[PDB]
């Protein structure tokens, strides 16, 4: 039972949004069905407040938050698992990521990336210097998805704090409780309350206000392509940082030894199945060159069978549920359909509500919905691709997405060919597409994002205006 | 009489857009009334062509262009003056600016701003490095205003060349001939023709295609607020760099000696009247603190009276016309009206068609349209402000714009207070708002721009995607 947090105040409403635990579809919490007026108030407070925190004070708040996350991780991951349905293993891991986000944002506070230009450069030159500096925006709108109820909020809120911005968060109504808890932690860690609000409600009531409120200088959104494209249409003349899906490959080249195939298999399974496969950067396509497929697939199969799927609150569970039963149903459907198109299902112990096992499918036609569309579940789909890198690259690039990628090979020449040729934001050699540090530049192209980078450092830049000034010299 | 330049080809149409010389309203040229299909063809060519120029080759082209601009400056400034009506003095100066743009873009080519991250940073760390690199976009759409028929095209086209992009430019139908000439110079300088097209036509025909063409990854536009806002609304899910007007102050603080007032007066008159006052960063509001106004105003008056305004092709003319007679009429109107509201017209030798003298007006109510609106002409309007910096800053910040500013003072404390307090993209101490180098970060906030920086360096970043790659280490 959680009210909204509007600049530190608990704000309630009559109507409720029920939050259900996807494992057994029971109500585990309720939050307000907030309305435009609530967001509107949150933004007015945000706009009127001018943060004056020193970099030291910002760092203290961010580092205090990091410890609170560590200290309370069991509690916080319980909340995550209860609304999202991912295993405690995955949700404990999420708290670790959020711990990194706050720690790195805290540490980046001592950093000033100002520049200096000399002006006596051309025939038009002058004896003068130009200096750079950053300033915060009026207010920032953050809209977050169900997949990382904690880490997604952390990524949007920590850089805002670090830069003396005021942010208003609207988490998805599917997983709003983690956000509300994070706000409480932040207020306790000493954040001036005006710097953060978390509002909840139905998209038809409060969603549009997040996009159109006149005080909002920047909308930062992570979510689906259709909602993303909608936002891009409706947030006129506001800066927008849009992080949409991925359809990311793990590419297995034919130079690999059997030992290496086994490591690549480890990556494939982990990358496909972590967070119940609910990552923009999950392995959604395992592109295996024909030559090595017969050796590779059995290794994948063997690993997929070891995974324990079931009760997410059980600490020995590897793989919990996906967000809900109809997502699970849709994913299994895409599997069945691939099979009818010629795919070979190797492992499928059966779906149970929102609980999908780590289904292994081989010889997936790469046109088939399963892999052409983004499939946001723990499917392990192997697409057999030619023993030709140009063909492999063209195939890898043939979807509407372009976020991240993983390539397993020991041949440098081929490595750099893929690095140069994949149309994506990130190419990871010998790691899953999902691999990054919380502060490296993160973002996709094509349908994966509108082309701006995120991660702690780029978010901090993104959340400021550069002001220049020049002095006689 | 000039055709469009579509990837090096001369492309004509039956219907013509007449280009008129604002000095005497006669037709000096004609260009095609291009249509959506022409733009569409330019963009298809752009998208299909993958530039492979080395950085060396790019630099050669850019630097060869610079020398052609210097070599042909008399010819080029003639073309500018004949379609825009600014004095030869101003149009020669414009060629110098474009000379700088190409020179600096050329020299910035040897630069690689790639970064390296170590990954062994947290408990989730790995023995790995992440590396950064930049890649060009599919196609860039550039839309330019009448203001700087040459320099505005230069700023959009040079960084595109420098980054192996393909750009399609649509100059305003008011001053399209300079753009067409620059395209010819670029082709001669060795640019692969696919990398540049210049199309012309009515906004109602070809304008929208520039905004919505599916190959366009980025729209870069400089122009009016209304047209800017329209573009922001219509270019869904495209990156947009929007540079709108300014309403920029020159602020005269009360610490100044009479000697310093005289220098400040020089800045006020130059900043107000240069390019016939047709700069987004023109001095449009001279905010003089009361204490010094009686000493300052006469110094302004005296300098305004020295300006020679008349035939733009006369080399001793300082001040040519504005873009057309109805703009001129609108600006004079705002002056009359300010006078009715209590302003004091000190010098106004009379308007003649599009030719506006450098009108000096004192005691301008700062609510009056003349200074509250952007007045894009060589008006010299003095607004008397209180001997209070907080009031001065609040007044300066009270318009819908926020681009640049100038502050004349010798008191460091007050300097830094204005630097921190003015809500603008740039604060120039002891220079006009318009002062910058062609490669320093340039851009406004509020109604002045959508919040992204331009100038050669930021443009180059803007016109690329950052791709990261990581290697086991």
Curated annotation (Swiss-Prot), chains A, B:
Outcome after substituting residue 97 to A: Decreased catalytic activity and decreased affinity for phosphonoacetaldehyde
Keyword terms of this UniProt record: NAD, Nucleotide-binding, Oxidoreductase, Plasmid
Pathway: Phosphorus metabolism
InterPro entries: Ald_DH/histidinol_DH (IPR016161), Ald_DH_C (IPR016163), Ald_DH_CS_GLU (IPR029510), Ald_DH_N (IPR016162), Aldehyde_DH_dom (IPR015590), ALDH-related_metabolic_enz (IPR051020), Put_phosphonoacetaldehyde_DH (IPR017656)
Keyword Nucleotide-binding: yes
Binding site for substrate: 97, 148, 279-281, 436
Catalytic activity annotation: phosphonoacetaldehyde + NAD(+) + H2O = phosphonoacetate + NADH + 2 H(+)
Enzyme class of the recorded protein, top EC level: oxidoreductase
EC number per UniProt: 1.2.1.-
GO molecular function: lactaldehyde dehydrogenase (NAD+) activity; nucleotide binding
Catalytic residues, chain numbering: 243, 280
CDD domains: ALDH_PhpJ
Keyword NAD appears in the UniProt entry: yes
Family: Belongs to the aldehyde dehydrogenase family.
Known partners and oligomeric status: Homodimer.
Function: Plays an important role in phosphonate degradation by catalyzing the NAD-dependent conversion of phosphonoacetaldehyde (PnAA) to phosphonoacetate (PnA). Has low in vitro activity with the related compounds phosphonopropionaldehyde (3-oxopropyl phosphonate) and glyceraldehyde 3-phosphate.
Protein's UniProt name: Phosphonoacetaldehyde dehydrogenase
Origin species: Rhizobium meliloti (strain 1021)
Lineage: Bacteria, Pseudomonadati, Pseudomonadota, Alphaproteobacteria, Hyphomicrobiales
């Amino acid at each position: 039972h959680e009210p909204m947090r509007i600049a530190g105040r608990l704000v309630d409403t009559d109507d409720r949004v029920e939050v259900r635990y996807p494992w057994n579809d029971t109500v585990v919490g309720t939050v307000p069905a907030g309305r435009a007026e609530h967001a509107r108030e949150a933004f007015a407070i945000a706009a009127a407040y001018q943060p004056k925190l020193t970099r030291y004070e910002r760092q203290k708040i961010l580092l205090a938050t990091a410890e609170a996350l560590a200290a309370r991780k069991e509690e916080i991951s319980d909340v995550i698992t209860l609304e999202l349905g991912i295993s405690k293993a995955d949700s404990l891991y999420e708290v670790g990521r959020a711990f990194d986000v706050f720690t790195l944002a805290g540490q980046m506070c001592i950093r000033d990336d100002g520049e200096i230009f000399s002006c006596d450069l051309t025939p038009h030159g002058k004896a003068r210097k130009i200096f750079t500096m950053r300033e915060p925006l009026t207010a920032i709108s953050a809209i977050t998805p169900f997949n990382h109820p904690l880490n997604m909020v952390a990524h949007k809120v920590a850089p805002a704090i670090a830069t003396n911005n005021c942010v208003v968060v609207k988490p998805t109504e599917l997983t709003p409780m983690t956000a509300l808890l994070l706000a409480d932690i932040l207020y306790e860690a000493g954040l001036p309350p005006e710097m953060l609000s978390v509002v909840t409600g139905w998209p038809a009531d409060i969603g549009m206000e997040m996009i159109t409120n006149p005080h909002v200088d920047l909308v930062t959104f992570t979510g689906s392509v259709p909602v993303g494209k909608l936002i891009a249409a409706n947030a006129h003349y506001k800066r927008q940082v849009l992080e949409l899906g991925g359809n990311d490959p793990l590419i297995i080249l034919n130079d690999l030894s059997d030992d290496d195939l086994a490591r690549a298999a480890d990556l494939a399974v982990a990358g496909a199945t972590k967070n119940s496969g609910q990552r923009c950067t999950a392995v959604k396509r395992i592109l295996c060159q024909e030559s090595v497929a017969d050796r590779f697939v059995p290794l994948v199969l063997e690993r997929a069978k070891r995974l324990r799927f079931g009760d997410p609150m059980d600490r020995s569970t590897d793989l919990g549920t996906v967000i809900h039963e109809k997502a699970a149903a849709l994913f299994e459907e895409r599997v069945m359909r691939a099979a009818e198109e010629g795919a070979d299902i190797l492992y499928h112990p059966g779906r149970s509500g929102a609980l999908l096992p780590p289904i292994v499918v081989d010889r997936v036609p790469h046109q088939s919905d399963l892999v052409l569309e983004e499939t946001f579940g723990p499917i392990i789909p192997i697409v057999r691709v030619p023993d030709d890198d140009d063909a492999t690259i063209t195939l890898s690039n043939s979807t509407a997405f372009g976020l991240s990628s993983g390539v397993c090979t020991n041949d440098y020449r081929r490595m750099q060919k893929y690095i140069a040729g994949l149309k994506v934001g990130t190419v990871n050699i010998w790691e899953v597409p999902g691999y990054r540090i919380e502060m490296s530049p993160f973002g996709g192209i094509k349908d994966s994002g509108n082309g701006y980078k995120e991660g702690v450092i780029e978010a901090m830049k993104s959340f400021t205006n550069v002001k220049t000034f020049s002095l006689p010299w």
